[PDB]
Amino acid sequence: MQIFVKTLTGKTITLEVEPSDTIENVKAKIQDKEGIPPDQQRLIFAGKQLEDGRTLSDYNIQKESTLHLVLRLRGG
Amino acid sequence: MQIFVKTLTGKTITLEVEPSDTIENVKAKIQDKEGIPPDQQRLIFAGRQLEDGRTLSDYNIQKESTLHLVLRLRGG
Amino acid sequence: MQIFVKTLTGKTITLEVEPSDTIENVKAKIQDKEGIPPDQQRLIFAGKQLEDGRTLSDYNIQKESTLHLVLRLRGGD
Amino acid sequence: XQYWXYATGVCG
C-alpha cells in the first residue's frame, strides 16, 4: 500500500509499505530519503506515538494514512 | 478580540477572547470547539509555556497573537 | 569562527566561538546578546542535547553550524 | 512531547 509522512518543513513523502512492516522498517525508509537516523525519529499517527517493534497492521494503519515525523533527541 | 492557535497538523483554530481571559479559559474554549481535554493541552507563546492562572494580558498576548498548541502524545 | 543559534521565538543570533569553547562558555555568549540566563538554556545540535562541561569540538560543531535553543515542557510525558 | 523548539514539539 502507500502511505504518507509529513515532515517539519511541510514536505510530504510517499512510502510503499506492507502491513507487516515494522515501525523500525518504516523509519529506515524515511532515513533512505531524508537522512534522519531511526533513533532520532518518532512517528505519530492520529496523535499517538508509534513504538518500535510493532507493525503498521498492529496500529491498523491502512492505505493513504498520514504519519507525522517528529525529532527525537539522541541520548548523550 | 481574536487569537489564533496553531496545531501540529498545521491547522489554525480561531478563538474569540478577551484580554482578561485566563489561560484556563482558553484551554476550555479549545475543549468546547475541538474536543481536547484541558489536561492534554500545552500552550506556547513567545518562547514560554503558558501557566493556567495567568491572563492573556499578563503574557502580553494581544489582538491577532498566535499561540502554539502542543498536545500530550497518546500511548497504545 | 561563527556559529548560529535559533532562539525559542525563531530569531537566529551569531556567535563568535572556538571549537575548544565549552557549552557553558557558549551559553554565557548567548546571555551577552539575548539576556537568556544560562540556567534556562538548553541547546541541541544535530538531534543531541549539549552538556555544559563538554566542548563544541566534542559534538563536531563546525563553522556556521546552527544550534537550537529548546524548551523542556513542565509535566512532559 | 517532552520538549518544544521553534516551532514544533520534540521528543527527548
Author numbering:
A (entry chain B), B (entry chain C): 1 to 76
C (entry chain A): 1 to 77
D (entry chain 1): 1 to 12
Quote the original article.
In particular, polyUb chains linked via K48 have been extensively studied in their function as the primary signal targeting proteins for proteasomal degradation. In particular, the focus has been on K48-linked tetra-Ub (Ub4) and longer chains shown to be an efficient proteasome-targeting signal, although recent evidence suggests that shorter chains as well as branched chains containing more than one linkage type have some role in this function as well. As such, Nawatha et al. had developed de novo cyclic peptides capable of selectively binding K48-linked tetra-Ub chains with nanomolar affinities and protecting them from deubiquitinases (DUBs) and the proteasome.
To gain detailed structural insights into the mechanism of interaction between Ub4a and K48-linked tri-Ub, we determined crystal structure of the Ub3:Ub4a complex at 1.85 Å resolution. The crystals contained two molecules of Ub3 and two molecules of Ub4a in the asymmetric unit. The three Ub units within each trimer form a ring-like arrangement and are mutually related by ~120˚ rotation around the axis passing through the ring’s center. Consistent with our previous NMR data, only one Ub4a molecule is bound to each tri-Ub. Despite the small size of Ub4a, its interactions with Ub3 are quite extensive (surface of the interface between the two entities, calculated with the PISA Server41, is ~800 Å2), resulting from the fact that Ub4a occupies the central hole in Ub3 and has comparable interactions with all three Ub units. Ub3 is tightly wrapped around the peptide, with all three Ubs oriented such that their hydrophobic patch residues are buried within the complex and facing the peptide. While they are naturally described here in the context of the complex, it is possible that some or many of them exist (stably or transiently) even in free, un-complexed, cyclic peptide. The cyclic peptide does not appear circular in shape but rather elongated and stabilized by five intramolecular H-bonds (magenta dashed lines in Fig. 5b). In particular, H-bonds between UbA and UbC (G75A—R72C and R74A—Q49C) and those between the C terminus of UbA and Ub4a (L71A—Trp4, L73A—Gln2, as well as D77A—Gln2) appear to lock the Ub3 ring with the cyclic peptide being held inside it.
